[model samples]
Target: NRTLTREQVLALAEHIENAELNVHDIGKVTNDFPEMTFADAYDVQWEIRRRKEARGNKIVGLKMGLTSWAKMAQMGVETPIYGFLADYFSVPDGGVVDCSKLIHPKIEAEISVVTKAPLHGPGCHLGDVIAAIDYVIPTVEVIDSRYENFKFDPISVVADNASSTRFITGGRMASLEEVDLRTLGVVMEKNGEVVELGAGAAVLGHPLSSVAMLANLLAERGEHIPAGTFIMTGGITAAVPVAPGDNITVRYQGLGSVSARFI
Candidate 1:
């Protein structure tokens, strides 16, 4: 692990921020750096996230990325990575964003688990995770890329906070009994066109496993996601791009639906 000087760290942060704010291509800025060698790029991303949290952003939950088996196969990976979300990133239903504010934006339909109690690691299981008590809700993750044409390596994406981007959640919450999450289907409407379809199984066979993976990850890092976290498992289907004047609707099999528009 390399300890970057504050200036170097901030330079990376600011350079990435330009991509975040639609200012530049992540690929272009880091073009001179070896893509495969910068595995610590994700560490740079976490450092920026840490700075955000320290500046008064609440750590709402941990989000796992690359959970889609198809995404893994496509990217030639076997597992996924995780990142933390600040309160500022949680947008509400019917929220509208400017298309001009994003670059190569993509939309994903996912389920969010809102925990009522804390969760710890060390031999954690699905049943143990579920027993913590919580409700699930329909969610839409707005994945905007800082990289040109949405291209980057594993560590690059990780450092970009797994494309942490923006998210919209909060609606009628459903319990495990209400819906077979593993079988839950997703209807993703992009600009009024049903562009993509998939199921919870798309995410490592079951979204619950994501939380399980998260717990084990935290345990290794000497941390835990804790109770009351809003865990956004990765996208349930192929992610579709977004633009201004586009409204995205994600309909789940049993958890109802949620929508967000961009202009």
Candidate 2:
């Protein structure tokens, strides 16, 4: 493994950022740096985030990726991954997503939670996540990978911020106590027909479990999920490819629905 040096890490960070800014795809970083470890990938990701903030963008939330067992199995992974979401990645509910700014955009329906209290971990569990939750809402994530043809290794995906492009969330905000999250259902429609269906348990057994996982994962970096932070619990269904003129609507059992159109 030819581990990259500090300067090489920054260079790779700039390389990825430029790819995203220019809306073009490049080969995966791992292709050129086979020695890159998960820690290095995350370092490159953090550098990218720092660069975004340095340019006046704000950090709004965090996101979990590959949380579903299906997704994990499909990707040959046993655990979920995490990513940061910038303020620019937010699209309003019912808003139009401009596909002209992306490369091979895809959509996934998910459950989102906004925390009302700080969540620290290393020992965080589902109950702790439930207690910290302020409310839950429906969300549609627009993922656009900067890698060529959306092909990359797991480590590369992590470095690329989990391919998070844009996200839309708006629906009935319900307290955790009001619903049985483990059995909560979700129906995702492309156009007017249901294309995918799943339940909250599809995400690491329960959506809150994803939250707990996030907390413990963050603790490794000496960080915690702060109050008032919005976090997406990963995709409930497989990501559906979409182009211009496609419409998507997702309905959650008790959280109402949210929709988006690609333009």
Best by TM-score: 2
TM agreement with the true structure for every prediction: 0.87, 0.95
Tell me each candidate's RMSD, in Å, in order. 2.6, 1.6
Distance from true location, Cα of 142 in model 1, Å: 0.1
- Runs in model 2 lying further than 4 Å from the true structure: 73-76, 149-152
* Clashing pairs in model 1, backbone N/Cα/C closer than 3 A: 42-159, 98-263, 99-263, 117-227, 118-227
**In model 1, which regions exceed 4 Å deviation?**
1-10, 28-31, 35-39
Candidate 1 at residue 257, lDDT? Answer: 78
lDDT of 2 by residue, 103-137 (tens): 88888888899999999889899989988999888
